[PDB]
């Protein structure tokens, strides 16, 4: 028995200038003295926003406010600014240990759908001398974040031999970029001809394939 | 200016003991006078970690009285100590595994029910944070990266593959920082080999591929590895 926090939604997508409503629910009723909120941006420590009966911490502007009673608590950002897009955590602090955080809500910028530009890169001759082949597929400047990448090697669908990495939302155009890297040995790589990256994204009418033929 | 200096070894091997320390500056842990604001007995010196892909996990806290509170998920392993004469408090975690790879933050917790004159904002929260110690638990040896070109093919895209390095991080720039527009440096991934890998890409006009020079600058501080790699059409 302990106080468990659940935040909702997992991700919130809003435009600058809109009002954001973030929710945090405690498993038991808790005094509003002990409901704290934090902002967390990539590459930085979390920062306290609201605590002790919805009082703003030092340096926190007026558009951040808190409300709630019993089990359901709310962080409100009355008018979003570009710097307000980040991850937000609630925390129970002082009612009963452990003083655990909620799962956090990612507040991202909502923009119109943007299709990715797709590029495929063969392994360089230099890497092949190292005994390994990496094939890189680039999905550039797309929205929303959800995308599917399917590697095909001489029309054989691959699974479990590639890794993905996604950038943070771009501060200028609010898009995402994704890379998928297929890793094969030199010996395996030279057994096949056509290396293809198939991309599915809601901004694309049909899946888009980029490919090369090994050696050309 | 209360601030927290984070130190301690961040590169560990499995089964070893993590040992981190934060030094408090701008205030004294051994000052038992109280004439203004919040009593220094109302501070709770705390540890919070974030593993990759997870949220914040409150580890525990210690008061200058020596009383501790620990998260039940780690209570069987964790130890938190305080040394007021050195303005230090520390975190110890033995028998570490890859599940302990995380950024570890120390922070000042505040829980005041009385005060003198004024109560500064930040009560009942962690109002001051250290900027973290990245900790990696791995049997891998410190290794500089291998940098391979992602050559432009037949708006063009090109880049560099910064592969097989340990530990994190690496800094990547283009043309010594003269090229920033259109650059995407992806977050590294941990490969199944235990080494990290990332790519850095940039979109450029196709017409510039004959004239413009494209060089990616990679700096891996833990191995003192600096690589300038030229990327040109193949």
Author numbering:
A (entry chain L): 0 to 27, 27A, 28 to 95, 95A, 96 to 213
B (entry chain H): 1 to 31, 31A, 31B, 31C, 31D, 31E, 31F, 31G, ...
Question: Which text from the study accompanies this structure?
Answer:
In this study, we investigated a donor who developed a family of potent HIV bnAbs with different lengths of an insertion in a critical framework region following infection with two founder viruses that were closely related and underwent extensive recombination. The bnAb lineage is defined by a CDRH3 length of 22 amino acids (aa), an IGHV4–34*01/IGHJ6*02 heavy chain (HC) and an IGKV3–20*01/IGKJ2*01 light chain (LC) gene. A greatly reduced ability for donor plasma to neutralize N332A Env-mutated pseudoviruses of different clades identified the V3-glycan bnAb site as the major target for PC39 neutralization breadth. Ab crystal structures show an extended CDRH1 that can help stabilize the CDRH3.
(a) Ribbon representation of PC39-17A with 11aa CDRH1 insertion. HC CDRs are colored (CDRH1 in yellow, CDRH2 in orange, CDRH3 in red) and the 11aa insertion in CDRH1 shown in blue. Structures of all three 11aa-insertion Fabs reveal an extended CDRH1 that provides support to and stabilizes the long 22aa CDRH3 (Kabat numbering) of the lineage. The similarity in backbone conformation (root-mean-square deviation (RMSD) = 0.3Å) and neutralization potency (0.10 vs. 0.09 respectively) of mAbs 17A and 50I suggests that the preconfigured interface in these structures is conserved across 33 months of Ab maturation. However, neutralization breadth was shown to increase during this time highlighting the importance of continued SHM. When compared to other V3-glycan bnAb Fab structures, 11aa-insertion mAb HCs (17A, 23D and 50I) most closely resemble PGT135, which also has an insertion in CDRH1, while the LCs of these mAbs are more similar to that of PCDN-38B, with an RMSD of 0.48 Å (S12(A) Fig). Most mAbs were sensitive to D325 and R327 mutations, yet only those with the 11aa CDRH1 insertion were sensitive to mutation at every position in the 324GDIR327 motif (S4(A) Fig). This difference extended to gp120 binding, with 11aa insertion variants displaying a higher affinity for gp120s as measured by SPR and an absolute dependence on N332 (S4(B) Fig).
